[PDB]
Amino acid sequence: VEVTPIMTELDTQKVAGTWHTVAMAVSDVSLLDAKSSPLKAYVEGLKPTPEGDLEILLQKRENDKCAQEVLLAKKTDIPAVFKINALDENQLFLLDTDYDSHLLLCMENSASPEHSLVCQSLARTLEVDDQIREKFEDALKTLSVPMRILPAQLEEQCRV
Amino acid sequence: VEVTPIMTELDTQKVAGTWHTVAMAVSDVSLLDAKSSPLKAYVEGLKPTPEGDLEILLQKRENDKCAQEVLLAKKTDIPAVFKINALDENQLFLLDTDYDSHLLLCMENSASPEHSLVCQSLARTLEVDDQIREKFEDALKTLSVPMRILPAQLEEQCRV
Ligand code: NA
Ligand code: NA
């Protein structure tokens, strides 16, 4: 157990730019609203702002259509923990893993952290495979709520 | 603004071992209980456990005597955010700054984050100077609550 989550001051350009959701994971007992599931929103880009907030560019599975959604996750009083009001969730964080080569984007609802927690594995290309899915599972085990990764699906509408 | 707080999986040995509090900082409007001020507790060591918690070994200014205090800050459902019930505070986090060469230890009380937030600058030796105090101020500015560093004091009872 040679690795643990800490907060670190990170070079903005390790976070900024284009990203692709290559895998998703949910808490063992997951109770998501359905009308706006975090599982239907695919990250396309990130951008830390000059004020310390985080912009997230998403594409969501919206009815059988694909819409663009821009979230401004706001700084809170604990560093690296952001406030949103979207996708059934109200808390968001980035988890930089496997020596800064694997970014996780995770969302939670403080009313029921154990039922609402979803994480997405982000990458600079849409390329997946077992090993990357295995690297995602390794990072998820350092999390408090037990988590399960969703089955790989090669094509997903609205996922760039 | 090329640097922002993210959560990262960090090598446990960057955190474990002996540390010394070389500077302290408080929120501009600080309202601390007085009977157990976070300003009278000096960190001596840290140890991430196999379960994901964090042990903190402190020495506190206890009446005009010096006592040893061991805190077991517990994992919560947001990574890198720990739960305590001590020193007037209930939330604790580590902030690794200035390219992992400067550890900050910060505590807060969720009832009033803006009044209770205190950070300590930790180092491998007790050596301070302006530049290190300046590096501490740089990291504190990425925090949401505005903060002020306390005047340097060369000798402080109970501070190893
Ligand atoms: Na601006
Ligand atoms: Na053990």
Curated annotation (Swiss-Prot), chains A, B:
It is found in: Secreted. It comes from the Eukaryota. Keywords: Disulfide bond, Milk protein, Retinol-binding, Secreted, Signal, Transport. Its main location: secreted. Disulfide bonds join 66-158, 106-119. GO terms for cellular component: extracellular region. The keyword Cell membrane does not apply. Under physiological conditions beta-lactoglobulin exists as an equilibrium mixture of monomeric and dimeric forms. Belongs to the calycin superfamily. Lipocalin family. This is Beta-lactoglobulin-1A/1C. It comes from Sus scrofa (Pig).
